[PDB]
Amino acid sequence: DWVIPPINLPENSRGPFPQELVRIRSGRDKNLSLRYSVTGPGADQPPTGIFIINPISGQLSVTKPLDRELIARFHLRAHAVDINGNQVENPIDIVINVID
Amino acid sequence: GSDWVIPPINLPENSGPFPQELVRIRSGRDLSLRYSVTGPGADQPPTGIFIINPISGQLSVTKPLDRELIARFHLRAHAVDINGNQVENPIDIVINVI
Ligand SMILES: [Yb+3]
Ligand SMILES: [Yb+3]
């Protein structure tokens, strides 16, 4: 399937935090109410809580200043589910690069 | 609770009608929280066997099961506020097909 272009993020960010990155959504959401989620190292696996996504808008943010010298890349996966919990789309890979 | 482990869920093979509601996994703090499950059986193959209601926390099975093919699943439930922030620590869920 089509690959979402990776993000580039300057290390030592100053926010203010949370600092909005990009919105990851399904076009079919304003047709069918969808609930968004994100998994992987940086989201729900260590380090937890660095990348969050709004359940309704699908807007993703970073919660703190990054450092490439400690970790230069994160690979997450966005999910979309209906009001019942049935996944509507397959999981999409999200790539983020810390730069400096 | 704060590290108490949830007892395994035992479900008989050859089950309906579906989706068949199993058990409610929720956080007493439900503040409007949203629930989601991860792992083999949910968002990893075999995909879509189990699903959780975003608002209620009701875990359901979607089709019949067979012990001889897969004997048990190991999922993880999550809780996140209306803004996506993690509020609870994810819990492990074990399902044994009998
Ligand atoms: Yb640096
Ligand atoms: Yb059997």
Side-chain angles (χ1 to χ4, degrees), chain A residues 1-13 15-34 36-100, chain B:
Chain A
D1 188 78
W2 292 113
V3 165
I4 300 191
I7 297 71
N8 282 255
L9 254 307
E11 79 182 11
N12 294 39
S13 332
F17 289 98
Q19 180 240 287
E20 310 188 292
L21 292 186
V22 68
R23 173 168 172 187
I24 309 279
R25 69 161 192 135
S26 200
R28 77 166 87 231
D29 69 3
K30 279 278 132 281
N31 290 299
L32 178 60
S33 227
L34 313 183
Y36 299 107
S37 59
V38 283
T39 53
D44 66 350
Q45 290 171 227
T48 59
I50 85 168
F51 289 108
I52 58 169
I53 205 181
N54 268 67
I56 333 114
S57 55
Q59 179 64 226
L60 188 111
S61 314
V62 206
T63 67
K64 33 131 44 213
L66 304 164
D67 180 6
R68 69 143 25 212
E69 290 94 307
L70 284 197
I71 182 170
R73 193 155 164 131
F74 289 98
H75 282 181
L76 322 185
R77 297 181 93 214
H79 303 66
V81 118
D82 68 2
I83 218 61
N84 283 33
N86 292 293
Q87 299 270 278
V88 287
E89 273 313 318
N90 287 307
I92 193 61
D93 310 281
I94 286 182
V95 178
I96 308 219
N97 302 269
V98 193
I99 54 195
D100 180 287
Chain B
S2 188
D3 273 340
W4 284 107
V5 350
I6 299 200
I9 312 183
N10 307 309
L11 152 294
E13 73 181 17
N14 307 356
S15 293
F18 305 102
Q20 190 170 49
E21 305 178 318
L22 294 198
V23 105
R24 265 198 76 185
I25 305 284
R26 76 245 91 142
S27 162
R29 301 183 235 177
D30 70 7
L31 196 65
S32 296
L33 295 193
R34 178 277 165 110
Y35 303 98
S36 71
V37 286
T38 54
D43 69 348
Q44 290 162 48
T47 186
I49 309 296
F50 295 98
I51 53 148
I52 203 172
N53 182 297
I55 53 199
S56 75
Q58 187 76 264
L59 188 70
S60 300
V61 84
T62 57
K63 58 180 287 287
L65 250 168
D66 177 81
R67 184 155 202 275
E68 298 84 343
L69 293 190
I70 297 177
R72 77 164 180 249
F73 292 88
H74 176 234
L75 329 183
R76 288 189 176 233
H78 316 60
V80 130
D81 65 40
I82 201 70
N83 270 152
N85 310 261
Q86 192 189 311
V87 281
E88 284 290 353
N89 200 121
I91 19 156
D92 260 295
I93 312 183
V94 183
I95 301 183
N96 294 291
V97 192
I98 64 93

PDB file of all heavy atoms in Angstrom, chain B residues 13-14 66-68, ligand 2:
ATOM      1  N   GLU B  13     -14.559 -24.127  22.876  1.00  0.00           N
ATOM      2  CA  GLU B  13     -14.439 -24.132  21.412  1.00  0.00           C
ATOM      3  C   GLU B  13     -15.816 -24.410  20.837  1.00  0.00           C
ATOM      4  O   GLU B  13     -16.793 -24.501  21.597  1.00  0.00           O
ATOM      5  CB  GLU B  13     -13.427 -25.190  20.923  1.00  0.00           C
ATOM      6  CG  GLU B  13     -13.841 -26.679  21.007  1.00  0.00           C
ATOM      7  CD  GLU B  13     -12.754 -27.619  20.514  1.00  0.00           C
ATOM      8  OE1 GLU B  13     -11.597 -27.213  20.396  1.00  0.00           O
ATOM      9  OE2 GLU B  13     -12.980 -28.817  20.223  1.00  0.00           O
ATOM     10  N   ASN B  14     -15.900 -24.493  19.506  1.00  0.00           N
ATOM     11  CA  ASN B  14     -17.141 -24.782  18.795  1.00  0.00           C
ATOM     12  C   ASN B  14     -18.345 -23.935  19.181  1.00  0.00           C
ATOM     13  O   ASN B  14     -19.475 -24.443  19.147  1.00  0.00           O
ATOM     14  CB  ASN B  14     -17.539 -26.258  18.951  1.00  0.00           C
ATOM     15  CG  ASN B  14     -16.428 -27.222  18.566  1.00  0.00           C
ATOM     16  OD1 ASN B  14     -15.374 -26.821  18.109  1.00  0.00           O
ATOM     17  ND2 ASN B  14     -16.668 -28.510  18.775  1.00  0.00           N
ATOM     18  N   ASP B  66     -11.211 -23.054  18.158  1.00  0.00           N
ATOM     19  CA  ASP B  66     -10.882 -24.477  18.184  1.00  0.00           C
ATOM     20  C   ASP B  66      -9.548 -24.605  18.851  1.00  0.00           C
ATOM     21  O   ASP B  66      -8.555 -24.064  18.366  1.00  0.00           O
ATOM     22  CB  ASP B  66     -10.843 -25.096  16.776  1.00  0.00           C
ATOM     23  CG  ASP B  66     -10.428 -26.555  16.790  1.00  0.00           C
ATOM     24  OD1 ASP B  66     -11.259 -27.457  17.057  1.00  0.00           O
ATOM     25  OD2 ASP B  66      -9.242 -26.820  16.533  1.00  0.00           O
ATOM     26  N   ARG B  67      -9.547 -25.331  19.972  1.00  0.00           N
ATOM     27  CA  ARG B  67      -8.375 -25.558  20.812  1.00  0.00           C
ATOM     28  C   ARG B  67      -7.189 -26.149  20.086  1.00  0.00           C
ATOM     29  O   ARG B  67      -6.033 -25.772  20.335  1.00  0.00           O
ATOM     30  CB  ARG B  67      -8.745 -26.486  21.995  1.00  0.00           C
ATOM     31  CG  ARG B  67      -7.595 -26.698  22.964  1.00  0.00           C
ATOM     32  CD  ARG B  67      -8.039 -27.067  24.388  1.00  0.00           C
ATOM     33  NE  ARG B  67      -6.976 -26.749  25.355  1.00  0.00           N
ATOM     34  CZ  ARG B  67      -5.963 -27.559  25.655  1.00  0.00           C
ATOM     35  NH1 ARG B  67      -5.883 -28.747  25.077  1.00  0.00           N
ATOM     36  NH2 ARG B  67      -5.006 -27.162  26.487  1.00  0.00           N
ATOM     37  N   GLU B  68      -7.501 -27.100  19.207  1.00  0.00           N
ATOM     38  CA  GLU B  68      -6.514 -27.826  18.427  1.00  0.00           C
ATOM     39  C   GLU B  68      -5.705 -26.883  17.480  1.00  0.00           C
ATOM     40  O   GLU B  68      -4.548 -27.162  17.168  1.00  0.00           O
ATOM     41  CB  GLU B  68      -7.207 -28.981  17.673  1.00  0.00           C
ATOM     42  CG  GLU B  68      -7.892 -30.081  18.558  1.00  0.00           C
ATOM     43  CD  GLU B  68      -9.331 -29.752  19.030  1.00  0.00           C
ATOM     44  OE1 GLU B  68      -9.769 -28.609  18.994  1.00  0.00           O
ATOM     45  OE2 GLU B  68     -10.126 -30.627  19.448  1.00  0.00           O
TER      46      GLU B  68
HETATM   47 YB    YB C   2     -11.539 -29.594  19.543  1.00  0.00          YB
END
